[model samples]
Target: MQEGKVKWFNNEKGYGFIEVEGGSDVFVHFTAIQGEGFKTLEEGQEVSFEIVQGNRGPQAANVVKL
Candidate 1:
């Protein structure tokens, strides 16, 4: 998993951006969190996740809120 901090989030819309370590920000959608304890996700929250190329850019998978 890659480590990062949440850079932006729209909780009501369930989407956000993660500032990945040494990488461009990645997109993170609720659907990608896959019920893996993402309920605690918040802006600037440190976390880790698996990443994959999304239609637009990189996206996080299996987000683990830390």
Candidate 2:
């Protein structure tokens, strides 16, 4: 897992980008935030998560809010 902060998210789309230290901004989908379907990542929230290479590089997974 890596440390990151939510830069922005769309309430309608429920997706956002996470800015990490020593890393480029990673992409995150609402589903990657495991545990619930109706999850919202409040902007500016710090979180711990995993980064993976998908169809897009540097995508986020297993996001847990700090």
Candidate 3:
């Protein structure tokens, strides 16, 4: 897993993107999250996740907000 920050998220969609420490954007789905969902996520909120190869790009898995 790697650490990063939340750049943006959609409350309706329950999905978002993370800006990794190296400045790379990774896709994150609600399924990857643990426990309850979020009403909102803050920009630059610390996060950790596993990186994997998506069909078109990189994605985050087993994501955890911190």
Candidate 4:
């Protein structure tokens, strides 16, 4: 898994961006978060995830707070 920090998340939109340690910013959708199905990502939170190629760019998958 890759490490990074949550750049920001939009509660109303259910989407966010992560600042990857050594890569480009990764896009993260709420659907990718693993938890009780009601998890919300916070800004500046440390997390681990897998990177995948999305239709537009890099996206984060299996994102979990650390």
Candidate 5:
């Protein structure tokens, strides 16, 4: 797992970017979050997760807030 801060998330949209030390931000979908109830990320929220390289490039998975 890797650590990063949430760049910005649209609670209504259920998607966001995780700002890590990579070339760019990692995309994070609500489904990727590993917790229960009203899953969402806040701007500047710290978290740890895995970076999955899919067809759309890097995405954050199994997100755990810290």
Candidate 6:
């Protein structure tokens, strides 16, 4: 898992971007987040996730808030 900060999230759109430590920003969708407890993310929130190469580009998955 890679550590990063939530740059921004659009709850209405169900998507967001995370600025990975030492890496470029990655796209994140609501469905990719692990929602055992919390489901939504906030700006600048620390998190850990896996980066996968989606068809469009790099995306964040299995997101967990820290």
User: What are the root-mean-square deviations of the candidates from the true structure over C-alphas?
Assistant: 2.2, 1.5, 2.1, 1.2, 1.4, 1.4
What TM-score would each prediction reach against the true structure?
0.78, 0.86, 0.77, 0.88, 0.87, 0.87
The number of residue pairs in model 4 that clash at the backbone is 0
The CA lDDT of each predicted structure is 0.80, 0.86, 0.78, 0.90, 0.90, 0.88
On TM-score, who's better, 2 or 4?
4
lDDT of 3 by residue, 1-66 (tens): 888888888868877888876677888777777558554466677888898887877888878788
Write model 2 residue lDDT over 1-66, tens digit each, in one string. 778899998879889899977878988898888665578898899999998888767689899888
Q: What lDDT tens digits, residue by residue, belong to model 6 across residues 1-66?
A: 878999999988889999976878999998888858556889999989998997898888899888
Q: Worst lDDT window (10 residues) for model 6? A: 31-40
Residue-level lDDT tens digits of model 5 in 1-66: 889999999999999999987657889999998777789989999999998898978888899999
For model 6, which pairs clash? none
- Residues 2-50 of candidate 1 have per-residue lDDT tens digits of 7899998888888889897788898888886645454545788888899
TM-score, ranked from best to worst: 4, 5, 6, 2, 1, 3
Runs with alpha carbons beyond 4 Å of true place in candidate 6 = none
Clashes of 2: 0
Clashing residue pairs, candidate 5? none
lDDT for residue 55 in candidate 6, whole number 0-100? 88
> What's model 2's lDDT at 61?
89
Select the stronger candidate by lDDT from 3 and 4.
4
Q: Compared to the true structure, candidate 6 yields what TM-score?
A: 0.87
